[PDB]
A paper describes a structure:
Type IV pili (T4P) are thin and flexible filaments found on the surface of a wide range of Gram-negative bacteria that undergo cycles of extension and retraction and participate in a variety of important functions related to lifestyle, defense and pathogenesis. T4P filaments are produced by the polymerization of pilin subunits in a process that depends on PilB, a hexameric ATPase associated with the bacterial inner membrane, while pilus retraction is powered by another hexameric ATPase, PilT. In Xanthomonas citri, two cytosolic proteins, PilZ and the c-di-GMP receptor FimX, are involved in the regulation of T4P biogenesis through interactions with PilB.
We also crystallized the complex between PilZΔ107–117 and a larger FimX fragment encompassing its GGDEF and EAL domains (FimXGGDEF-EAL, residues 255–689) in the presence of c-di-GMP. The PilZΔ107-117-FimXGGDEF-EAL complex crystallized in space group P42212 with one copy of each protein in the asymmetric unit (see S1 Table for data collection statistics). The PilZΔ107-117-FimXGGDEF-EAL crystal presents the same two principal modes of crystal lattice contacts between PilZ and the FimX EAL domain observed in the previously published PilZ-FimXEAL crystal structures from X. citri and X. campestris, in spite of the different fragments used and different space groups. We name these two modes of contact interfaces 1 and 2. The most significant difference among the three structures has to do with the orientation of the first helix in FimXEAL domains: in the X. citri PilZ-FimXEAL and PilZΔ107-117-FimXGGDEF-EAL complexes (residues 429–454 and 436–454, respectively), the helix is oriented so as to contribute significantly to the interaction with PilZ in interface 1 (362 or 308 Å2 and 234 Å2 of buried surface, respectively) while this helix is rotated approximately 140o, pointing away from PilZ in the X. campestris PilZ-FimXEAL structure. While interface 1 involves a β-sheet extension and tenuous contacts between PilZ and the c-di-GMP ligand bound to FimX, interface 2 is dominated by hydrophobic interactions. Together, these observations raise the possibility that interface 2 between PilZ and FimX EAL domains may be physiologically relevant.
Residue numbers in the entry:
A (entry chain A): 436 to 689
B (entry chain B): 9 to 72, 78 to 106
The structure:
């Protein structure tokens, strides 16, 4: 019970970040292997307390204990679009990939927020990509379909992260058409040096290309990975090999 | 390269240990500068013990409050749950 006061220290820090400065965003380039170069970044949430930066792995555990995740994902999406706005004012047609949660499927405020903010900042919905894992999309399906339809009704792109994984995934694909897929690290980490993996992947891409579904690889670290992903037709790649994560959009794609 | 952290008593443990982190964490001072989600290797000596526990963890806090280091998140495998339980045991003593 001594620590219970420290928990609330943290929670008050969080809500004050929700309503004021504290939260910020960092940006990692996503690169088009195949060669339709698009200014594409994935957005990562961060929290700053007097120069102390911290990762959502520190604080999301608490935040969930207070049904606060929905307001946070709203912040992410909203500041992401403001950044798309500043980015359009600079004369750049930049896109932003944005992690959202499955509770935000049920969030009417989220559908509002998306709409409102694209309007004010004059941002075409195809600049926004929202991704959510195949796991939680499975758990929460009826709501996920409602959300995908409402949001893709704004020319937004909706996708699955941590794709691959199990054999229930191509089952979900029948019932869910996303703009893109993010392959689970377990599949793509070793593709350099397996036969399980590249078998699985070329299977996934061969099925994925004609549906109009974009395939993307995460956590690229070496060059043999990239040649495998390329020969294999993966559409997008991001990782420390490609380009590291920062707070400024400054990558020269092409 | 190689990080190390030696906690001599349960107070130094409690000051390092980050219990609210998703799956436990530990604050490791280092002069060197890391970016969040960088993947570190750390050699963690617990107090009331001589075994060095090997932690392959992730950065989830950069401080450049107190101390000048990094928060290292324990892997979610059994190998990391192990060290988390060792520490949680030590602190309620
Ligand atoms: N996705 C990805 N990450 C890469 C890659 N290369 C390096 N990383 C780094 O490794 C961490 C991976 O994030 P995660 O494990 O998926 O787990 C993430 C994720 O669960 C969560 N998170 C990050 N950004 C957001 C966000 O905008 N919204 C929400 N709801 N959660 C977020 O925080 C965790 C920690 O992320 P970070 O501390 O920023 O640290 C990130 C990131 O900086 C890559 O190719 N792809
Ligand atoms: Mg600002």
């Amino acid at each position: 019970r001594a620590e219970e006061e420290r928990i609330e220290r943290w929670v008050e820090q969080l809500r004050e970040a929700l309503v004021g400065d504290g939260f910020l965003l960092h940006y990692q380039p996503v690169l088009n292997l195949q060669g339709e170069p698009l200014e594409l970044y994935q957005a990562f949430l961060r929290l700053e307390r007097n120069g102390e930066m911290m990762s959502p792995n520190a604080f999301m555990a608490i935040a969930e204990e207070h049904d606060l995740v929905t307001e946070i994902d709203r912040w992410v999406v909203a500041r992401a679009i403001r950044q798309l706005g500043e980015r359009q004012r600079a004369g750049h047609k930049t896109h932003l990939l944005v992690r959202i949660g499955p509770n935000s499927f049920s969030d009417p405020q989220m559908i509002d927020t998306i709409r409102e903010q694209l309007a004010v900042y004059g941002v075409p919905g195809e600049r926004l990509w929202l991704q959510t894992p195949e796991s939680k999309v499975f758990t929460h399906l009826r709501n996920a379909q409602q959300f995908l339809a409402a949001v893709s009704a704004m020319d937004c792109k909706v996708g699955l992260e941590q794709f691959g994984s199990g054999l229930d995934s191509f089952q979900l694909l029948a019932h869910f058409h996303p703009a893109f897929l993010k392959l689970d690290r377990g599949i793509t980490g070793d593709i350099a040096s397996a036969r399980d993996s590249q078998e699985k992947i070329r299977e996934i891409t061969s099925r994925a290309q004609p549906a109009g579904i974009l395939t993307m690889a995460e956590f690229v670290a070496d060059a043999q990975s990239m040649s495998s992903f390329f020969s294999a037709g993966v559409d997008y790649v991001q990782g420390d090999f490609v380009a590291p994560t920062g707070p400024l959009m400054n990558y020269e794609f092409g | 390269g190689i990080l190390s952290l030696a906690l001599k008593d349960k107070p130094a443990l409690y000051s390092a240990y980050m219990p609210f982190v998703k799956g436990g964490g530990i604050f490791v001072p280092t002069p060197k500068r890391y970016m969040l989600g960088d993947e570190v290797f750390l050699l963690l000596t617990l107090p009331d013990s001589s075994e060095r526990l090997p932690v392959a963890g992730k950065v989830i806090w950069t401080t450049p409050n107190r101390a000048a280091g990094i928060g290292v998140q324990f892997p979610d495998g059994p190998e990391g749950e192990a060290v988390r339980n060792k520490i949680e045991t030590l602190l309620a003593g």
